[PDB]
Paper text:
The tyrosine and valine residues are conserved in the R2lox group, and the cross-link was observed in both R2lox proteins that have been structurally characterized. Both proteins also comprise a hydrophobic channel leading to the metal cofactor wherein a long-chain fatty acid molecule is found, which coordinates at the Mn/Fe ions of the cofactor. The mixed-metal cofactor in R2lox self-assembles with the manganese ion in metal-binding site 1 and the iron ion in site 2 if both MnII and FeII are available.
The valine was changed to alanine, isoleucine, or leucine (V72A/I/L), and the tyrosine was changed to phenylalanine ([name]). Very weak difference density for the oxidized conformation in the other subunit suggested that the reduced state conformation was present in at least 90% of this molecule (not shown). This asymmetric behavior might be caused by different packing interactions of the two molecules in the crystal. It should be noted, however, that other mutants that crystallized in the same space group (V72A/L-R2lox) did not display large differences between the two subunits. No impairment of O2 reduction could be observed in [name]-R2lox in solution.
Residue numbers in the entry:
A (entry chain A): 3 to 286
B (entry chain B): 3 to 250, 263 to 286
The structure:
Amino acid sequence: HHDGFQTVKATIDWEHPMFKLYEKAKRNGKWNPADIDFSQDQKDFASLTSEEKISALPLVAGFSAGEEAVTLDILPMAHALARQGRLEDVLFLTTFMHDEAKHVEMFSRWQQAVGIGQMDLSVFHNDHYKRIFYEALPEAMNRLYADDSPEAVIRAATVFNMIVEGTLAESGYYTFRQIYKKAGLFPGLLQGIDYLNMDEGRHIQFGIYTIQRIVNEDERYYELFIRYMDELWPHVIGYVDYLTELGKRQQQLARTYALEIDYDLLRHYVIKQFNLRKKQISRT
Amino acid sequence: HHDGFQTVKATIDWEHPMFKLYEKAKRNGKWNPADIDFSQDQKDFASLTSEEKISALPLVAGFSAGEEAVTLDILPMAHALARQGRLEDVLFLTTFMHDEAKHVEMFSRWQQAVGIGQMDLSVFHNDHYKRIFYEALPEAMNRLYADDSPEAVIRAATVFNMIVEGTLAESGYYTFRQIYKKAGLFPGLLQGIDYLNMDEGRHIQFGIYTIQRIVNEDERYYELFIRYMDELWPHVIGYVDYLTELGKIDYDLLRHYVIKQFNLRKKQISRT
Ligand SMILES: CCCCCCCCCCCCCCCC(=O)O
Ligand SMILES: CCCCCCCCCCCCCCCC(=O)O
Ligand SMILES: [Fe+3]
Ligand SMILES: [Fe+3]
Ligand SMILES: [Mn+2]
Ligand SMILES: [Mn+2]
Ligand SMILES: [Mn+3]
Ligand SMILES: [Mn+3]
């Protein structure tokens, strides 16, 4: 039951950081995946050899499942904050959810347009990827239906916003640009990547706000955060190593397009992102 | 756990009715409550007598609580459909949820602008309103976390989409236009109502689609729909009567519009 309603007894808290983020989302999130022109992407894909064609799919496979996972797995967070009466957070989470729906749609339209919609891309999820996206992420979010303690909320935000989004998605955006933007390939996809990357900034800021407000109540939670980050790292780097090793074995795309794909710089960016995320949370 | 992902094994079902409605929501859902100019609404409200001021509040009280209730109480429906693998429904429900947030925002911005944000409008919720919005609606949706059976889904969609939205919300939009548009009062608010009414068409289409696809499996479910509609009518009309009595504008025309919406919603569901 509802005991009352905030906007009947009072108003929205207009100065709440999440209401301000919600207003930014409305202003900055108007893009529509249906408006992206993928016609040149289709031509680029068909111009590639079977061997070059496969070079690009592992990354798209990771994103496509990732967007879908987070579309579904953000609902428990919105439920738990709704039950705590955090209306401004809930308002913002509606934009977060609608962003992720558009992200799922974007990568699925690209797959459809380039002619791989019928291909099962699951073969590029190794065991580390599944640990995070098939298991740890849904376990941490679904927990919130029965356990919305600060410990549970920190853990959900950490897996979802600081690892999945703040570490893996950010490094994927960077990787796309280092490879495909340099090569001049897939302009529709990269347009979408740029929209995603802009949306993502708000998603990570929600996670920072959520973790920090819990850490502000009791310093002890800061060490929970750092520990949950470190618990997930081996799967992060285990997925990244797997992508890196696939890429090192399919060098035709880089040759054809004259790219020196520094896979060690990419791996260093993942490590940098991970430690950046850790540092955006303060003990006090 | 996730067994796999539809957009990795395959793609979105591009032809699915709820993917189509999602596409229409993105195209038609761009409005922003923050762009509405409420400055004249403030002047209009200040120029009313104390008695005319309090005449306006009950309806706004009903809407502001109602938008907040549906923003929160749609989440179990999104979860239950997500859990059933209905990805296109979920994509649509993200637009549904973001619409209701903008609706909460619009009425709260209006209360703030005209200077009643500090006032507690709960006094204008009678027992019948609380039965629907404080109790029956969250009960029926929250049930879906543990019981997503066809019977529970039809009950949730009936209470939410056919009664709260299809009967009360539609009637309230009609009421606002009949009273205030003929009076040249609250033009910001009425612009917001026009946007809300456009959004609400899709929300009702979702409810119809949901109830009808469950009825198509078994006609027994048609009779459950009609029964649950009738179960709620006494509270719908109890609330409408309470509002009508406060106003005492052709109030019997409004009252009959509510009955007209109620029967229209029944008719939009086919036994077969
Ligand atoms: C070759 C270097 C590897 C770089 C690492 C790339 C990681 C791929 C990204 C897949 C996960 C995407 C998750 C989306 C999350 C969201 O939208 O919130
Ligand atoms: C005086 C005649 C009475 C007319 C009926 C007025 C009913 C007021 C409406 C309040 C409930 C609004 C529910 C919001 C649901 C939504 O927008 O999805
Ligand atoms: Fe995200
Ligand atoms: Fe609605
Ligand atoms: Mn390993
Ligand atoms: Mn009564
Ligand atoms: Mn995303
Ligand atoms: Mn509404």
